[PDB]
A paper describes a structure:
VhCBP is a periplasmic chitooligosaccharide-binding protein mainly responsible for translocation of the chitooligosaccharide (GlcNAc)2 across the double membranes of marine bacteria. The chitooligosaccharide-specific SBP is localized to the periplasmic compartment of the bacterial cell wall and serves as a mobile component of the (GlcNAc)2-specific ABC transporter. SBPs share a common structural feature comprising two domains connected by a flexible hinge region. VcCBP and VhCBP belong to cluster C/subcluster IV (C-IV), members of which are specific for oligosaccharides, including mannooligosaccharides, cellooligosaccharides, and chitooligosaccharides.
A similar effect was observed in F437A, that is, the hydrophobic interaction with the N-acetyl methyl group of the reducing-end GlcNAc was likely eliminated by the F437A mutation; however, in this case, the hydrogen bonding network formed by the Arg436 side chain was partly affected by the Ala mutation of Phe437. F437A also showed a relatively large change in the binding affinity. By contrast, the reduction in hydrophobicity in the F437A mutation may not only have weakened hydrophobic interaction with the N-acetyl methyl group of the reducing-end GlcNAc at the site 2 but also added a conformational restraint to Phe411. The F437A mutation may have also affected the hydrogen bond network formed by the nearby amino acid, Arg436, with the N-acetyl carbonyl group of the same GlcNAc and with a bound water molecule. These subtle changes resulted in a rather large impact on ΔG° (ΔΔG° = +4.1 ± 0.3 kcal mol−1). The specificity toward GlcNAc may be mainly attributed to these two amino acids, indicating that mutational study of Arg436 and Phe437 may lead to specificity-engineered sugar-specific SBPs.
Author numbering: 1 to 535
The structure:
């Protein structure tokens, strides 16, 4: 039997938890691989829908409702029948318990109803023509189970009943678990992989040793000097790094320290911070050239240059370009003066301060970015130092607003909305299932208004104009400090399997992370290599 060795997420130890709604504590082979979505949107290729457990969808009248045609003939892993009430239950479960909304679905779908056994209708809080994409983000769980569970909020779901291709827990150790083919998988014919083999790997260092020794199949980790360390180790070691989303330094607007709050809430300081940074050098040293300078004050990025209002871009690009003397003169003009002779600037009220900059433990490319930033900042007289907390500590500090500055990446869509909405919609700064992206706690009502209306009208020109408005608001206030546009790191080994996506076969986002539903489509294309013979 063919075992595919994947690595979606670092863990120090595996804790059995396959609850699809617990993204911050579950195992990361749960969405897609255990719970198949209704539709997979191919984000790299214009968000083209690939219909899965749903056959078709159709929006309404006024962009204010939608129906999904549930495919019949689809059975759960236990034997039961995938139907509309599963969808129905699932969506009610998220409105009842908004802790389980990881997407923001509850601010869109205002109710959900079983048209019949194979059709569901959703009604909206407002016109959003992109709401089928949002709808697809919600996990759909078997009603004949989850309805009767004590607390879904804490159900660890250790023997999952799933619709996806890999639902069987074959083995489970704290250092290894193997996930095996659903015996009622509807697309079983298309599937040529037996099992998912998930080893426990805690950081990029432990990962490095395995991957260069040919021990992995499908991974998406950072690999330093990848040509001379991994590519050079075997001709079987391949990779494909298509362009990804924005990475930025995010500053806390609600920092509880008086002195730090005084610096971070000041647009002149954020701009000076930004001008102190040498973006291309960060890309070259920390990422070994694997990235693109982002000198958009709005964070838009060169992948979306087509969307860009070039007036706005040019007006603020100087604040987002390496210029240490410019940084120093801005600090002086703004009044951040060193008044206690240590060479580091103090706030307008005369207070000394040091910025603690955080990135997740083990994410070494980001750790080294922060450390380059600390030195670049010191050259213009801004005192800072690095911290590398465990991801969950890192994440919590942002949700709780206790951090000073955080370096982070964002999810990346087929248009600027995925980035701009997740990074700036102030509604996403509240709610316990919310990711870290918006947690700068900068709030602008006009901005939320523009974000909320982006898919409200089918006018391509008007929509572009809304994007110009968003771009201008964010750039003027230098809300974050955008640094670069990164890559979808992806490594594959041709030793044991074939059919991989790559430059000559770019079928979609190739990565194995949770939050890349396309990985479901990717594993279906994979096929074992004929290595040995019968007798
Ligand atoms: C948008 C987002 O948050 N993506 C997360 C990934 O960045 C993250 O992958 C990790 O990315 C680090 C930063 O480049 C890498 O150094 C690290 O190797 C990589 N880890 C793995 C296992 O690929 C993943 C997993 O932590 O979570 C994504 O959501
Ligand atoms: Ca296939
Ligand atoms: Ca098969
Ligand atoms: Ca000082
Ligand atoms: Cl901009
Ligand atoms: Cl484009
Ligand atoms: Cl366009």
């Amino acid at each position: 039997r063919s075992e595919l060795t994947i690595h979606p997420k670092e863990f120090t130890t595996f804790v059995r938890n396959f609850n699809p709604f617990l993204g911050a504590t579950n195992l990361h082979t749960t969405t897609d691989f255990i719970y198949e979505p209704l539709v997979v949107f191919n984000e790299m290729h214009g968000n083209t829908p690939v219909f899965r457990l749903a056959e078709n969808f159709q929006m309404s009248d006024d962009l204010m409702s939608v129906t999904f045609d549930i495919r019949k003939g689809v059975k759960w892993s236990d034997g039961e029948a995938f139907t509309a009430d599963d969808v129905v239950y699932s969506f009610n479960l998220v409105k009842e318990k908004p802790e389980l909304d990881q997407s923001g679905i509850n601010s869109w779908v205002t109710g959900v109803e079983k048209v019949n056994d194979y059709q569901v209708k959703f009604r909206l809080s407002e016109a959003n023509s992109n709401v089928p994409y949002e709808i697809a983000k919600v996990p759909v769980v078997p009603k004949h189970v989850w309805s009767k569970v004590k607390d879904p909020s804490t159900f660890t779901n250790e023997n999952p009943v799933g619709s996806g291709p890999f639902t069987v827990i074959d083995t489970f150790t704290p250092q290894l678990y193997i996930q095996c083919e659903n015996p009622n998988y509807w697309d079983a014919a298309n599937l040529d992989v037996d099992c998912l083999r998930v080893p426990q790997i805690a950081n990029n260092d432990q990962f490095l040793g395995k991957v260069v020794n040919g021990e992995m199949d499908w991974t998406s980790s950072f690999v330093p000097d990848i040509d001379r360390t991994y590519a050079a180790a075997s001709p079987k070691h391949h990779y494909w790094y298509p362009p990804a989303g924005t990475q930025a330094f995010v500053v806390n607007f609600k920092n509880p320290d008086a002195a730090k709050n005084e610096a971070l809430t000041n647009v002149d300081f954020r701009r000076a911070f930004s001008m102190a940074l040498d973006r291309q050098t960060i890309i070259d040293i920390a990422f070994y050239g694997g990235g693109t300078v982002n000198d958009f004050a709005s964070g838009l990025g060169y992948a979306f240059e087509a969307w860009s209002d070039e007036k706005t871009h040019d007006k603020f690009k100087a604040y987002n370009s390496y210029n240490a003397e410019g940084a120093k003169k801005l600090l002086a003009k703004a009044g951040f003066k060193d008044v206690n002779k240590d060479g580091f600037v103090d706030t307008p009220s005369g207070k000394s301060f040091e910025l603690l900059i955080q990135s997740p433990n083990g994410w070494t490319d980001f750790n080294n970015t922060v450390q380059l930033a600390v030195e670049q900042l010191a050259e213009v007289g801004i005192k800072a130092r690095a911290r590398t907390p465990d991801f969950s500590v890192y994440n919590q500090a942002m949700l709780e607003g206790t951090y000073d500055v955080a370096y982070t990446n964002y999810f990346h869509g087929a248009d600027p909305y995925t980035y701009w909405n997740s990074a700036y919609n102030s509604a996403l700064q509240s709610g316990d299932g919310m990711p870290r992206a918006a947690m700068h706690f900068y709030k602008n009502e006009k901005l939320d208004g523009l974000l909320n209306s982006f898919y409200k009208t089918a006018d391509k020109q008007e929509q572009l104009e809304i994007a110009h408005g968003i771009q201008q608001i964010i750039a003027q206030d230098q809300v974050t400090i955008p640094v670069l546009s990164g890559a979808y790191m992806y490594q594959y080994n041709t030793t044991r399997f074939t059919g991989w996506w790559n430059e000559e076969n770019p079928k979609g986002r190739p990565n194995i992370w949770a939050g890349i539903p396309e990985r479901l489509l990717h594993v279906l294309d994979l096929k074992p290599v004929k290595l040995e013979h019968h007798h």
